[PDB]
Scaffold this active site. Sequence first.
Site, PDB file in Angstrom:
ATOM      1  N   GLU A 167      81.407  76.461  41.459  1.00 17.31           N
ATOM      2  CA  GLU A 167      82.346  75.797  42.341  1.00 17.31           C
ATOM      3  C   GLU A 167      83.227  74.828  41.594  1.00 17.31           C
ATOM      4  O   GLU A 167      84.441  74.920  41.668  1.00 17.31           O
ATOM      5  CB  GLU A 167      81.567  75.042  43.414  1.00 17.31           C
ATOM      6  CG  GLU A 167      80.834  75.941  44.392  1.00 17.31           C
ATOM      7  CD  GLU A 167      81.757  76.591  45.417  1.00 17.31           C
ATOM      8  OE1 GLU A 167      83.001  76.661  45.211  1.00 17.31           O
ATOM      9  OE2 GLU A 167      81.217  77.042  46.449  1.00 17.31           O
ATOM     10  N   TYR A 212      84.476  68.387  47.587  1.00 21.41           N
ATOM     11  CA  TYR A 212      84.331  69.749  47.087  1.00 21.41           C
ATOM     12  C   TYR A 212      82.887  70.153  47.156  1.00 21.41           C
ATOM     13  O   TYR A 212      82.021  69.471  46.608  1.00 21.41           O
ATOM     14  CB  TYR A 212      84.860  69.893  45.634  1.00 21.41           C
ATOM     15  CG  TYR A 212      85.339  71.299  45.378  1.00 21.41           C
ATOM     16  CD1 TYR A 212      84.434  72.320  45.169  1.00 21.41           C
ATOM     17  CD2 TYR A 212      86.695  71.628  45.396  1.00 21.41           C
ATOM     18  CE1 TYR A 212      84.845  73.590  44.965  1.00 21.41           C
ATOM     19  CE2 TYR A 212      87.116  72.938  45.198  1.00 21.41           C
ATOM     20  CZ  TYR A 212      86.165  73.918  44.986  1.00 21.41           C
ATOM     21  OH  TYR A 212      86.485  75.243  44.799  1.00 21.41           O
ATOM     22  N   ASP A 268      88.614  75.068  33.294  1.00 14.58           N
ATOM     23  CA  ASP A 268      89.392  76.202  33.820  1.00 14.58           C
ATOM     24  C   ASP A 268      90.804  75.733  34.067  1.00 14.58           C
ATOM     25  O   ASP A 268      91.120  74.571  33.841  1.00 14.58           O
ATOM     26  CB  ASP A 268      88.741  76.952  35.032  1.00 14.58           C
ATOM     27  CG  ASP A 268      88.639  76.151  36.321  1.00 14.58           C
ATOM     28  OD1 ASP A 268      89.093  74.984  36.432  1.00 14.58           O
ATOM     29  OD2 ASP A 268      88.042  76.731  37.268  1.00 14.58           O
ATOM     30  N   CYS A 269      91.695  76.628  34.456  1.00 18.53           N
ATOM     31  CA  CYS A 269      93.085  76.241  34.427  1.00 18.53           C
ATOM     32  C   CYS A 269      93.396  75.141  35.433  1.00 18.53           C
ATOM     33  O   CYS A 269      94.175  74.264  35.133  1.00 18.53           O
ATOM     34  CB  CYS A 269      94.015  77.403  34.659  1.00 18.53           C
ATOM     35  SG  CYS A 269      93.405  78.684  35.704  1.00 18.53           S
ATOM     36  N   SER A 270      92.778  75.204  36.616  1.00 20.27           N
ATOM     37  CA  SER A 270      93.026  74.210  37.651  1.00 20.27           C
ATOM     38  C   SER A 270      92.227  72.939  37.369  1.00 20.27           C
ATOM     39  O   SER A 270      92.643  71.868  37.797  1.00 20.27           O
ATOM     40  CB  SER A 270      92.670  74.798  39.003  1.00 20.27           C
ATOM     41  OG  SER A 270      91.374  75.339  38.919  1.00 20.27           O
ATOM     42  N   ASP A 303      91.648  73.177  43.144  1.00 18.46           N
ATOM     43  CA  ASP A 303      91.883  74.594  42.878  1.00 18.46           C
ATOM     44  C   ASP A 303      93.374  74.968  42.801  1.00 18.46           C
ATOM     45  O   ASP A 303      94.254  74.273  43.326  1.00 18.46           O
ATOM     46  CB  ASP A 303      91.166  75.444  43.934  1.00 18.46           C
ATOM     47  CG  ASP A 303      89.635  75.409  43.809  1.00 18.46           C
ATOM     48  OD1 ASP A 303      89.118  75.109  42.740  1.00 18.46           O
ATOM     49  OD2 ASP A 303      88.936  75.690  44.798  1.00 18.46           O
ATOM     50  N   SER A 304      93.661  76.102  42.168  1.00 23.14           N
ATOM     51  CA  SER A 304      95.051  76.488  41.889  1.00 23.14           C
ATOM     52  C   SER A 304      95.848  76.844  43.165  1.00 23.14           C
ATOM     53  O   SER A 304      97.063  76.528  43.265  1.00 23.14           O
ATOM     54  CB  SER A 304      95.107  77.641  40.882  1.00 23.14           C
ATOM     55  OG  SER A 304      94.649  78.859  41.445  1.00 23.14           O
ATOM     56  N   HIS A 351      96.406  81.444  38.800  1.00 21.63           N
ATOM     57  CA  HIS A 351      96.579  80.714  37.545  1.00 21.63           C
ATOM     58  C   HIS A 351      97.574  79.581  37.722  1.00 21.63           C
ATOM     59  O   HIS A 351      98.513  79.678  38.517  1.00 21.63           O
ATOM     60  CB  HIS A 351      97.006  81.646  36.386  1.00 21.63           C
ATOM     61  CG  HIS A 351      97.084  80.944  35.066  1.00 21.63           C
ATOM     62  ND1 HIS A 351      95.970  80.426  34.439  1.00 21.63           N
ATOM     63  CD2 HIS A 351      98.142  80.599  34.293  1.00 21.63           C
ATOM     64  CE1 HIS A 351      96.338  79.830  33.318  1.00 21.63           C
ATOM     65  NE2 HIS A 351      97.650  79.908  33.214  1.00 21.63           N
ATOM     66  N   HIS A 410      98.169  75.178  29.100  1.00 21.81           N
ATOM     67  CA  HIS A 410      97.144  75.573  30.051  1.00 21.81           C
ATOM     68  C   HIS A 410      95.802  75.815  29.404  1.00 21.81           C
ATOM     69  O   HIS A 410      95.675  75.930  28.172  1.00 21.81           O
ATOM     70  CB  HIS A 410      97.606  76.834  30.864  1.00 21.81           C
ATOM     71  CG  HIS A 410      97.828  78.077  30.053  1.00 21.81           C
ATOM     72  ND1 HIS A 410      98.217  79.279  30.632  1.00 21.81           N
ATOM     73  CD2 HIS A 410      97.717  78.325  28.721  1.00 21.81           C
ATOM     74  CE1 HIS A 410      98.322  80.200  29.690  1.00 21.81           C
ATOM     75  NE2 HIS A 410      98.050  79.647  28.524  1.00 21.81           N
TER      76      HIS A 410
END
Length: 305
Positions: free
Chosen positions: A55, A90, A209-211, A228-229, A263, A275
């Site tokens: 998560e 979250y 991660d990207c976000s 989140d993205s 992404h 990124h």
Amino acid sequence: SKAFIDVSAATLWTAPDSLRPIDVPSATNPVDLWKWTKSMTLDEKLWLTNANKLETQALLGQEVTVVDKKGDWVKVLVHGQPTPRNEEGYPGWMPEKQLTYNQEFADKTNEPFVLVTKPTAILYINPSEKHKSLEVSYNTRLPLLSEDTISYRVLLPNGQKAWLRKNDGTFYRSQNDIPTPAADDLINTGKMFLGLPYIWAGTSGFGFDCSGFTHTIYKSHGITIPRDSGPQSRNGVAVDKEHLQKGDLIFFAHDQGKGSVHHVAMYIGDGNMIHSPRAERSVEIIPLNTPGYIEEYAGARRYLP
């Protein structure tokens, strides 16, 4: 009820009791997150995403609401990580042994704090019967107790006292009093992490991660954006391709930009973006006009006032 993260970073799972043996160093107190990530093959990292296992991650001292308990695992809502899934925080599952509660720490949550400003840094517990120490992530916030010429003293969520070198942190009165960043500040922040390997759900200087990367960069500069993205792509102010500026967040979506967002990157000017892109890679700078990315371009958002 109220609890606090008691490890450098806690990893939250989509279900309890889902660890593999290789994931054990993420679930202990203390954690060893370099052992966790560096021990994994590519396939083992990809399983986290493809079996939908994780998560988010929450840092040392972050507050959570405990909402359920199954055996040794609790379900928690992480405050300060916005999501449309839950208005309080979250959600996800983590070992109870990675949580603590100390009234003194709880009372000092709204006091001036030290924000860790290097990718990771070492905290030295003092006094400590066994001369313990802890490697902590960028964006960790702990209440400031005192400052000398070389160090800040801070309070840990378990009620112990610790210190870090002044060059490893900055103090601030509150999240609300972190100065408004220039775009270059955000970029410079991201650049510190160049070469850091990706991990799904990563939300710390041990891997992003990207976000988690974008959320962490903004949050550390006083601007709380969604975790989140997808939600990131629908918050802040819409920006058109012709008007992209440094700091703007750029989104990529499935099916040539028409489907779900999967992404996010930050524009750094001159046609480039920074990124944390995928498990095969690390925090990096690439052109916006990179094959794959350009066909999936799904808009841009501005979060700077």
